[PDB]
Ligand binder design. Structure first.
Ligand code: ADP
Ligand code: ADP
Ligand code: MG
Ligand code: MG
Lengths: 232, 232
């Protein structure tokens, strides 16, 4: 589903051409849990931004579900992200004055404006909140009234919202504790294995990378090696 | 307040190095209404992104209130945008499930978390809504219940919110009609002239550019010329 061919991403700081991704080659299978491991600076997040269609590779070529995103105009690019990708992050990113169920409704508003009813949005939003294994009785609560763990479960239901086959997570458990951090992981595993979601998680903590079928070790902008752990 | 020195912004599309801003030099005085005029492609918005601290110049140097933003880490960069800049755009950008007054509270939440009270946020939010000349009786309304004009008045109160000396507008009246489009302009004029705000507006419609003390004509990434219209 996600595919890369000779991607490079440079950052011109003037006289300093810095390379974040160098001649990187990858191919993520549909419904495959993959993890990008590396220290701060490896180029992990840069890659999560390109695959997420948040950025353009200074070379190479990105394929999302076999579709070359490179030349797509911003409008078309936004159609990709909103339909083909589900985002999650370390920084929860919830709106402070919206109920857990409202934060899940937003993406659905932006995709289906004027098509779906308030009743249908409230329903889908809950299905995704229930799917993200957050008790229904916590739907009406706002951000600061939920455990940091419950908060990530909201970012997850919001990402699952418009039903994207892809889910990218950037150091999702960085903000949590080992115990709840594992539940979230066990949750991405659930989605991938059962629901069939193509999960790609970026991390520096190897313990998280182990939930992936394969870890892709990234070093100073380049892929040092790959590690297959399961599907033999 | 805003200052540029030999800024260039290139976009590597691979074998194609495209230039959006080429060796551009500018200096906006404090409390000065300036307009960047140009056809779609001039490089206007690119410049609005750099001045807004949304992007980094591939060369040159940006000064916001005399402070060089170039080397600032993302955290420090965010402190700049949230404290020194007030954004507005053609695309209103309001959250659909939040009341006009709530959309104005958000920036204040993000800057003053845990410091200010619900009562103080509700007050400042209204002051800015009243300043943006939107009747107080429209505070409790949500987006789709306000005239497109009332909606821009919300983006304006939200921008004025954390009290930024700067206000950048990107084709603010593009989405409106001539009549209400002029009221919004007359409103930025109000802020600049009375309140003392440094207003910089990016546009392709010359009729809007005329509210500026000087128009900066931009052509294919370069400043073709400048036009002083008032302070002689
Ligand atoms: N917007 C940017 N401007 C300049 N350099 C960048 C930018 N984004 C990333 N980099 C560079 O890319 C490298 C790492 O990329 P990054 O996305 O931060 O990955 P990681 O999460 O592993 O640190 C760093 O050396 C950094 O300097
Ligand atoms: N993210 C980008 N990637 C590649 N090219 C860009 C990007 N942003 C702007 N450009 C280029 O910059 C030029 C105009 O810049 P832009 O910000 O769109 O200004 P304007 O509003 O006047 O069109 C165009 O030629 C465009 O191709
Ligand atoms: Mg990172
Ligand atoms: Mg533009």
């Amino acid at each position: 589903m996600i595919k890369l061919k000779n991607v490079t991403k440079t950052y011109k700081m003037g006289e300093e051409i810095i390379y974040a991704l160098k001649n990187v080659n990858l191919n993520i299978k549909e419904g495959e849990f993959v993890s990008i491991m590396g220290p701060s600076g490896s180029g992990k997040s840069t890659m999560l931004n390109i695959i997420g269609c948040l950025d353009k590779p200074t070379e190479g070529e990105v394929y999302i579900d076999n579709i070359k995103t490179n030349d797509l105009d911003d409008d078309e690019l936004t159609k990709i992200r909103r339909d083909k990708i589900g985002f999650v992050f370390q920084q929860f990113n919830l709106i402070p004055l919206l109920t857990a169920l409202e934060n899940v409704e937003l993406p659905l508003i932006f995709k289906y404006r004027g098509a779906m009813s308030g009743e249908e949005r409230r329903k889908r939003a809950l299905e995704c909140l229930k799917m993200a294994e957050l008790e229904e009785r916590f739907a009406n609560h706002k951000p600061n009234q939920l455990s940091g763990g419950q908060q990530q479960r909201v970012a997850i239901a919001r990402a699952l919202a418009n039903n994207p086959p892809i889910i990218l997570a950037d150091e999702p458990t960085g903000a949590l504790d080992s115990k709840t951090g594992e539940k979230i992981m066990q949750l991405l595993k659930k989605l991938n294995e059962e629901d069939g979601k193509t999960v790609v998680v970026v991390t520096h903590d190897i313990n998280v990378a182990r939930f992936g079928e394969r870890i892709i070790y990234l070093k100073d902008g380049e892929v040092e090696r790959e590690e297959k752990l399961r599907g033999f």
